[PDB]
């Protein structure tokens, strides 16, 4: 999950007077925009590569003509 | 007036693209079989080897 | 899930003074309205097409007369 806050602005509190809905919207927006595509797809990426390696290992015996 | 967004869209789009590729291969497969169905006239078979 | 906000309006906060119930209502309304029907039905659409392909593949042997 991505947590987002506005960047540019005795130290007191720094309330942003924004509701929860706006926070969730901002999280979704910046998650789609800023986060790297590979950074998000890495689990599926590794899964697909491992599955393809397994398939190309098993097709040696899974092809009936040579099986 | 409202600006909105739903989470899966971009991911879905990517997914859909890959999905289309699969279907494409599927169609190609049928074509070959169809050609194999419509080039050899499998209704009559003569051994001519045995 | 669809997140919605009003569109037309040193940058300070932009509170919409709307409660959670209104947010959920707006999400449902715009989800029904704006989101494309195919965009929402894509999972069921793919599932139905795959099921029909499987059924028409297996009916070759599932038909007892030729089975």
From Swiss-Prot, chains A, C:
The volume-regulated anion channel (VRAC) channel forms a trimer of dimers, with symmetry mismatch between the pore-forming domain and the cytosolic LRR repeats, a topology similar to gap junction proteins. The cytoplasmic N-terminus preceding the first transmembrane (residues 1-22) regulates volume-regulated anion channel (VRAC) conductance, ion permeability and inactivation gating. The lineage of its organism: Eukaryota, Metazoa, Chordata, Craniata, Vertebrata. Disruption phenotype: Mice do not show remarkable changes in body weight or the weight of white adipose tissue on a chow diet, but display significantly lower body weights and fat mass than wild-type mice when fed a high-fat diet. Moreover, improved insulin resistance induced by the high-fat diet is observed. The chain holds residues 51 to 152 of 803 of the full protein. Belongs to the LRRC8 family. It is found in: Cell membrane; Endoplasmic reticulum membrane. The chain crosses the membrane at residues 40-59. Induction: Induced during the earliest stages of adipogenesis. Non-essential component of the volume-regulated anion channel (VRAC, also named VSOAC channel), an anion channel required to maintain a constant cell volume in response to extracellular or intracellular osmotic changes. The VRAC channel conducts iodide better than chloride and can also conduct organic osmolytes like taurine. Plays a redundant role in the efflux of amino acids, such as aspartate and glutamate, in response to osmotic stress. It comes from the Eukaryota. Heterohexamer; oligomerizes with other LRRC8 proteins (LRRC8A, LRRC8B, LRRC8D and/or LRRC8E) to form a heterohexamer. Homoheptamer; inactive, likely because it is not targeted to the plasma membrane in the absence of LRRC8A. In vivo, the subunit composition may depend primarily on expression levels, and heterooligomeric channels containing various proportions of the different LRRC8 proteins may coexist. This is Volume-regulated anion channel subunit LRRC8C. Expressed at very low levels in adipose tissue.
């Amino acid at each position: 999950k991505i947590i987002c806050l506005p960047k540019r602005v005795e130290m007191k509190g720094l309330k942003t007077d924004l509701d929860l809905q706006q926070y969730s919207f901002i999280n979704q927006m910046c998650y789609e925009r800023a986060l790297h595509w590979y950074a998000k797809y890495f689990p599926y990426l590794v899964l697909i590569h491992t599955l393809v390696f397994m398939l190309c290992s098993n097709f040696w015996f899974k092809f009936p003509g040579s099986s | 007036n409202f600006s909105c967004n739903h989470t899966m869209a971009h991911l879905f789009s990517k997914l859909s693209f890959c999905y289309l590729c699969f279907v494409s291969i599927y169609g190609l497969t049928c074509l070959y079989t169809l050609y194999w169905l419509f080039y050899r006239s499998l209704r009559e078979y003569s051994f001519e080897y045995v």
